[PDB]
Design a protein around this ligand. Structure first.
Ligand SMILES: Nc1ncnc2c1ncn2[C@@H]1O[C@H](COP(=O)(O)OP(=O)(O)NP(=O)(O)O)[C@@H](O)[C@H]1O
Ligand SMILES: Nc1ncnc2c1ncn2[C@@H]1O[C@H](COP(=O)(O)OP(=O)(O)NP(=O)(O)O)[C@@H](O)[C@H]1O
Ligand SMILES: Nc1ncnc2c1ncn2[C@@H]1O[C@H](COP(=O)(O)OP(=O)(O)NP(=O)(O)O)[C@@H](O)[C@H]1O
Ligand SMILES: Nc1ncnc2c1ncn2[C@@H]1O[C@H](COP(=O)(O)OP(=O)(O)NP(=O)(O)O)[C@@H](O)[C@H]1O
Ligand SMILES: [Mg+2]
Ligand SMILES: [Mg+2]
Ligand SMILES: [Zn+2]
Ligand SMILES: [Zn+2]
Lengths: 635, 635
DNA sequence: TACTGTTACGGCTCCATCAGATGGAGCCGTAACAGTA
DNA sequence: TACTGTTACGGCTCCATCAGATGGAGCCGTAACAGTA
């Protein structure tokens, strides 16, 4: 009736002991970097998978793969578990919806077993693969096959029906089975990934979902919550790590981590129901949910100064030749149901034309007639909706670009000048100044065949990634290993008189990563930490006073405090005289915008029109828009 | 704390509900054919494996394979399970001890990871593979490697040490790692199979062992029981299906099935401790253990009549050029520790020479000088230690040889003579008289890719395996489908006036298979049922009054009642004037023998000498023999 | 002449056993070119 | 002359993703040959 964990010390967990109720809807909350993933996916799921795998033969074990042994003492009440990872999965161009959701395999099995020589219900394999999800489901629900075929193909038909029912329930009935998985939107790809693993329900199985609401509108999130509630009612346990308020409100139990991030978190601050979390002063999530701490809606919203960006004849993808006016110099939020065509408009027309017109880029934009009002802009800065790549040869210092300046100033010292060194000597990714016994890695990763990998630190350089010859040159009493060793606050104090480094380090501090180390590997970063690193990298660039910031969903992996900090940064940028355009599903970011352009009313072929246009108060007066309904509810 | 099963109806289970204690030594007893395997390996293990597999992806599922869904309602308290099947596994000549026990893989991993360029402890891969188990274990326990190598290769060394420790504990220290697995004795192969799956212990794992004591002496069984007790004390649950008295006496809980076999069993008769089972009148196992029912030791043992079989210079395999005298006309039991060389003597010299001398066979015997006393014999009948092959095209009627006579008498009828039919028309394995829609199978087995197979009965012949044209000819009002449909008692009454069929059917009844059907598939037979079918096939042959019966472990898969029946049959054969020689580890069979030849004192290179020779009472006076010690204990 | 052993020969079925590679995409470091200030 | 965009190019690393085959052994059915009784 419980999953009891004792002595969990993985990553930054501070020897925490927790009890998780079984056959319930449990939600794990906390700040970005608290340790929710290290507790759910890296301890419980890892222990369950290892326990299941250890009972199999070596031949099967070397195919399935063994996870790393978690640093835990005793876990009880486990069971078979299915986990959905937080990180998004890229797709090859060949993979389609049917291939990804494992529907084509069942289709081939059915056609091979009860096929009529290649005719089940009066259709062939291509005629049934090239249909929308809703009509394919209604076709498969009206299959008049014989009794022998019914007995033979019971399981295949049941699996197909369950998968199609889930895909219809989430709201993806407009897609077909032949649509390429690599061209779907963020929310559609997230829902397809969810349906791949959770479409066919089981019994007595723990489901661990790490942020299952990427690029999902509130309406889509409600349908996903209904499906999750049905799956839990099927006799299962659900462990969902989320930052969404609706997910917490729709859960039986809440486990709150914190109280901070990195080395200041890894603990348990509060637990109980939603009201219990709200009443706990030590819980930051409860403080933000109870209204004690909140993002303040402006009393007066900025008005356009007469300069507008007019997009005429926008017909890219599913856009139905619409005209959109984006005011300049204010904060504008682009809203719509997942798949309605907000990314395909903004990121594929506005940014792709602004870059060519201003930054002298060579990227072909989408299908549009013309854009007017470009002359009121100087440069464009964009943040994509795609995640960042993770390599052990990467860290926040290299990603943001300050490591180049640090290496240059290290190579400009007196001793380095005497020895004839350059900036390439002070990097652990170039031969000449790095330890060759570890190739600048610092630690050695030994990979076994079927056993979990073992990490052993290097002994020649003691994990410093550099040899003594390169470590013999120091700047202000510190060598480059100590430079990579200090955190962002220490580096901010260290380089306070160097504007070039100080600007980017101050940006990193302002996005909320002062605790992080300059040399922490990208592979060991968190989702929110990587998102904020990308945000700081893009926002650390120089602003000319009349510049456009285009952000495509910068809320992913961010707690309420993090989005509050980002909102403050964006509002300061707006007050500086720049124009900020944000494609956002987060309603807290939306409620502070001075202008809203809403698209819909549906996704795919059912959307692409400007349902609403104006200030949030005016949009809330429109009953057609779901965004308007939610805005009216929360205003 | 329990494994609760409800509504189990697999095979012949009569909707039984049981509760199995956890972290205990549980033994399941009952008659041959009661349903112990169908309850342990076909319900609990099947459900656990299916539940674990269903949580994985299709790619891994179609590699691991899905077991058939058991006919059960609700099973709780499950966990990862490791099962050892009752049926023995044949081995290719290429496989060795290290390959089978998964020790070579760990050896290669260690040599690749901490090798010194190919030198770990001062030895190479061949110099360490070509050693006995004890010296290899003592070498690996004295490895003076460096600290970095110690940290790197901790798990590999731990696994190797645990496997070698188990192999030494069971008593196989005289074997090597390069020894071919296909040339081992029955007990040695059984112990190697056990060590493959149970050598490295785990925690919180259910172990299901189906008859883990094939070809094991009492001394070897004691060591195996000690190892099993240690493994259970490591925090595990053990479910052992056994007929051995020592295994029941060394278990915390006993679950008894019955009260019979086939359609007369499948229930639960009693449960509790050993004393509780003994005190239950409805429990046949308790009745045999408590002494109410027993095999009666003869008051006076038959003496040799002056005719002996002298084997001079027996040096085959591990035999040390020994001389053995086997009295003729009495019951002689060959006893010894597993590997001492009883099979290599008897089956490889005595039978292989008697067959050539009497049955005009062309099989080359082993290494011996000569055998004297052959002229007092007319024919030899042998039962091998190997199990029988299982095919769906097989049944007891075809195996024993009565189906040929039945087909001949069916083809000799008036209507068959008029139509010009032959015996080949009345068989479901020859084209012409069988249904071609199922190829004489009766049912169709549809195999999926990763889903469990589905069985659908044929519709053209309704599962009768024959068409209407072949079913239109009947003998005594019954067609051949009804002939295959009746049980052995019905066929015994049916063919009471036909001596040829009646002899074999009476033999089948006498071995205890009167309930079984003539047409039951061999693949669906039980281990004890197959053993008794082979015994009846070999014992149904004509006896000339002076003939030698050689039986190599005919007790496998047989309860105490079955071995009592077999002992009675063998004693009747002896009283008929024939000579019976039985290689037996069962002490109840041994105590009734009129002569005993004991070999030992150890296995492999440590045995091959006649430790004792004489009547069981005289052998019990020798302290050298473990067999003598047990005989003294039980006499 | 029939019962009882052996052998071969064709067809059918069960079981052991082995121990990832290739294409796609992102990131670091370096160089080159161009527009402003 | 310096700060800030773009592009290319080499090297390194992470991730998706596909959808068993072959040799060995036992058994049924049939035929042929031989030793007795
Ligand atoms: N190897 C490591 N050693 C120590 N700390 C680590 C290591 N890897 C990650 N961390 C830190 O451990 C903290 C928790 O990581 P993680 O559990 O992934 O965060 P999270 O709670 O899921 N955050 P988010 O996904 O953004 O909501 C973060 O501050 C990481 O930077
Ligand atoms: N390359 C493409 N070819 C065809 N259709 C596409 C392509 N890319 C996207 N679409 C479709 O265009 C519609 C709008 O997608 P897009 O504009 O990217 O989504 P969005 O509204 O921003 N929603 P989301 O990203 O989930 O928050 C969806 O139905 C997509 O499936
Ligand atoms: N498909 C089937 N349908 C009905 N009965 C079956 C089937 N398969 C096997 N049986 C019978 O079910 C009974 C129990 O089988 P099984 O569980 O294998 O026996 P067991 O208890 O392990 N006996 P043994 O191994 O000799 O000690 C036997 O009489 C089988 O002949
Ligand atoms: N072909 C072979 N070549 C070499 N050694 C062999 C061979 N067959 C058996 N041995 C060994 O000879 C010894 C005696 O084996 P064997 O006589 O078959 O055993 P047994 O005494 O009858 N015991 P068991 O069959 O387990 O009850 C063992 O050490 C075997 O490993
Ligand atoms: Mg996370
Ligand atoms: Mg059995
Ligand atoms: Zn090093
Ligand atoms: Zn048929």
């Amino acid at each position: 009736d419980y999953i009891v964990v004792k002595g969990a010390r993985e990553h930054n967990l501070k020897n925490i002991d927790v009890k998780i109720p079984r056959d319930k809807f449990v939600v794990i909350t906390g700040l970005s970097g608290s340790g929710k993933s290290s507790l759910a996916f890296d301890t419980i799921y890892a222990e369950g998978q290892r326990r299941y795998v250890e009972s199999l033969s070596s031949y099967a074990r070397q195919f399935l793969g063994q996870m790393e042994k978690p640093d835990v003492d005793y876990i009880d009440g486990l069971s078979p578990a299915i986990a959905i990872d937080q990180k998004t999965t890229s797709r090859n161009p060949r993979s389609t919806v049917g291939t990804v959701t494992e529907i084509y395999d069942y289709l081939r099995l059915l056609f091979a077993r009860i096929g009529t020589p290649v005719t089940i219900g009066g259709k062939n394999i291509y005629e049934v693969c090239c249909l929308s999800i809703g009509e394919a489901k209604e076709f498969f629900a009206n299959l008049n096959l014989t009794e022998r075929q019914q007995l033979i193909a019971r399981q295949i038909l049941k699996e197909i029906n369950a998968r199609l029912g889930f895909l219809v329930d989430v709201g993806l009935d407009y897609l077909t089975l032949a649509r390429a998985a690599g061209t779907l939107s963020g929310g559609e790809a997230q829902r397809i990934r969810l349906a791949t693993q959770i479409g066919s329900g089981l019994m007595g199985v723990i489901y661990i979902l790490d942020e299952p609401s990427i690029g999902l509108h509130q309406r889509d999130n409600d349908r996903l919550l209904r499906s999750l509630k049905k799956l839990r009612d099927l006799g299962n346990t659900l462990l969902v790590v989320e930052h969404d308020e609706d997910t917490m409100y729709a859960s039986d139990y809440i486990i709150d981590l914190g109280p901070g991030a990195g080395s200041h978190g890894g603990q348990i601050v509060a637990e109980g129901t939603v009201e219990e979390i709200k009443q706990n002063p030590n819980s930051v999530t409860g403080e933000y949910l109870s209204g004690r701490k909140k993002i303040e809606v402006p009393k007066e919203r900025r008005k356009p100064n007469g300069k507008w960006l007019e997009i005429i004849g926008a017909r890219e993808n599913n856009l139905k030749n619409i005209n959109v006016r984006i005011p300049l110099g204010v904060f504008t939020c682009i809203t719509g149901v997942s798949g309605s065509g907000k990314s395909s408009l903004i990121n594929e027309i506005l940014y792709k034309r602004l870059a060519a017109e201003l930054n002298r880029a060579s990227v072909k934009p989408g299908e549009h007639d013309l854009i007017k009002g470009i002359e009121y802009l100087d440069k464009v800065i964009d943040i994509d909706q795609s995640p960042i790549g993770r390599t052990p040869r990467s860290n926040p210092a290299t990603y943001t670009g300050v490591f180049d300046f640090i290496r240059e100033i290290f190579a400009n010292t007196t001793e380095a000048k005497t020895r004839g060194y350059k900036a390439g000597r002070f990097s652990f990714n170039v031969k000449g100044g790095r330890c060759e016994a570890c190739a600048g890695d610092g630690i050695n990763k030994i990979e076994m065949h079927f056993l979990p990998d073992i990490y052993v630190p290097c002994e020649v350089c003691k994990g410093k990634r550099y040899n003594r010859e390169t470590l013999e040159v120091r700047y202000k009493g510190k060598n480059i290993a100590e430079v990579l060793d200090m955190t962002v606050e220490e580096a901010l104090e260290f380089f306070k008189n160097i504007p070039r480094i100080h600007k980017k380090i101050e940006t990193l501090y302002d996005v909320g990563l002062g605790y992080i180390k300059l040399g922490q590997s990208s592979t060991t970063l968190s989702g929110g930490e990587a998102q904020r690193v990308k945000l700081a990298t893009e926002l650390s660039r120089k602003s000319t006073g009349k510049t456009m910031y285009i952000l495509d969903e910068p809320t992913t992996g961010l707690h309420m405090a993090d989005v509050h900090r980002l909102v403050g940064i964006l509002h300061r940028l707006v007050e500086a005289g720049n124009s900020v355009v944000v494609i956002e599903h987060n309603l807290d970011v939306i409620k502070t915008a001075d202008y809203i352009i809403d698209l819909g009313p549906e996704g795919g072929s059912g959307g692409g029109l400007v349902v609403a246009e104006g200030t949030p108060e005016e949009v809330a007066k429109v009953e057609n828009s779901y965004t308007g309904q939610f805005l009216k509810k929360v205003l």
